[PDB]
Design an enzyme around this catalytic site. Structure first.
Site: not given
Lengths: 129, 165
Positions: B55, B60, B63, B102, B113, B122, B126
Site C-alpha cells: 500500500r 501520504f 506501507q 494498526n 509505514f 495520526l 499510531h
C-alpha cells in the site's frame, strides 16, 4: 476559538447573523468578515456559524462544501475492509463532524481546520452572484 | 546504549532500486524498536525479507510489513500476533518518519509505514518509532509507484534487510 479552547460567544454569533441578514451570506464584505473571525476557529466553530445561518444561497454554499468533500474523499479513499491503516485524512474529520469541541482544537486537526476554513471561504466566493 | 540502525534493500519488479536505512528510537520506544529490528534481521525465523509494500499512497506514506498475507490483513510481532501501543511520545512530524500500522488501539503486529508527508492527524493513534536515515530518495522513488488507493503499479519488495553496525 483557540487561544485553551473557548466556544463561539453569543456576541459574535449575533454579530455574524446581523452581517448575513443585512448584506447576505455571499456578499464580499460578509466573506471578508468570515475570513477574519474564523482565523482561530476549529471546524466545529465554523459549523456553528454556518448552522445558525437562516435557511437559497445558504444551501448552495453548503452544496459547494459537500462537493469539495466528495472530491477530497475520492482522492483520499480509506483502506479496504480488513486491512490495517493508517487512515488518510478524511473529509468528515476536516469538517469536524463528530469531534468534541475540545478534540477539534487539538494538534491532530491543526492543518485540517486550516484547510476547512479555506474550503468554506472558497465555497462562499464560488456562490457569489 | 545506542539506537539501532536497520536497512531494507528495495527492489522494483525484482530489479534493485536501492537501500533505505532507519534509526530506531529504542531510547523512547524500546519494545516497538526491538520488534522492527528483530523482524528485519530474520533472527526469529520470520520477518520482512522478501515481503512487499502492499500500500503506497503518494503524498501520504508507504506501507509494508505484512509478511504473512501480503495485503494488509496479516503480519505478526515477536511478542505474539498483536502487542499494545507502547506510548505516543513521538509525533508524525514529516517525511521519513517510521510508524506502526494498526487496525485500532493495541493492534500492533509487523506492519509499518514510512511517512512521505507530515501526517499529524495520526498523532496519538499510531506509535512512531524511527526515521529514515539514508535513502529518502529511494523512498521517494517507491512513492511514485503508488496510487490514490495504495495499489502499486510495480511490485515493490524488500529484497534483503538486516541490521547495520
Amino acid at each position: 476559538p483557540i487561544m485553551e479552547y473557548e466556544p463561539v460567544g453569543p456576541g459574535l454569533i449575533a454579530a455574524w447573523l446581523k452581517q448575513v441578514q443585512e448584506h447576505g451570506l455571499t456578499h464580499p464584505a460578509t466573506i471578508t468578515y468570515f475570513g477574519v473571525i474564523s482565523i482561530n476557529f476549529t471546524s466545529v466553530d465554523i459549523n456553528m456559524l454556518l448552522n445558525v445561518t437562516p435557511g437559497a444561497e445558504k444551501q448552495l454554499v453548503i452544496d459547494k462544501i459537500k462537493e469539495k468533500a466528495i472530491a477530497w474523499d475520492e482522492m483520499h479513499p480509506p483502506p479496504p475492509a480488513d486491512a490495517a491503516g493508517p487512515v488518510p485524512l478524511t473529509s468528515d474529520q476536516i469538517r469536524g463532524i463528530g469531534l468534541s469541541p475540545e478534540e477539534a482544537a487539538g494538534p491532530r486537526f491543526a492543518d485540517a481546520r486550516t484547510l476547512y476554513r479555506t474550503w468554506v471561504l472558497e465555497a462562499l466566493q464560488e456562490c457569489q452572484r | 546504549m545506542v539506537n539501532p540502525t536497520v536497512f531494507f534493500d528495495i527492489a522494483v519488479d525484482g530489479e534493485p532500486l536501492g537501500r533505505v536505512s532507519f534509526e530506531l528510537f529504542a531510547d523512547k520506544v524500546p519494545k516497538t524498536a526491538e520488534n522492527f529490528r528483530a523482524l528485519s534481521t530474520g533472527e526469529k525465523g520470520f520477518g520482512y525479507k522478501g515481503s512487499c509494500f502492499h500500500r503506497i499512497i503518494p503524498g501520504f506514506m508507504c506501507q509494508g510489513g505484512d509478511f504473512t498475507r501480503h495485503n494488509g490483513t496479516g503480519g505478526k510481532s515477536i511478542y505474539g500476533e498483536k502487542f499494545e501501543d507502547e506510548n505516543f511520545i513521538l509525533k508524525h512530524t514529516g517525511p521519513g518518519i517510521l510508524s506502526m500500522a494498526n487496525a485500532g488501539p493495541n493492534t500492533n503486529g509487523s506492519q509499518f509505514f514510512i511517512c512521505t508527508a507530515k501526517t499529524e492527524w495520526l498523532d496519538g493513534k499510531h506509535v512512531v518509532f524511527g526515521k529514515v536515515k539514508e535513502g529518502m530518495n529511494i523512498v521517494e522513488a517507491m512513492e511514485r509507484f503508488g496510487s490514490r488507493n495504495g495499489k502499486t503499479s510495480k511490485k515493490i519488495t524488500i529484497a534483503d534487510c538486516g541490521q547495520l553496525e
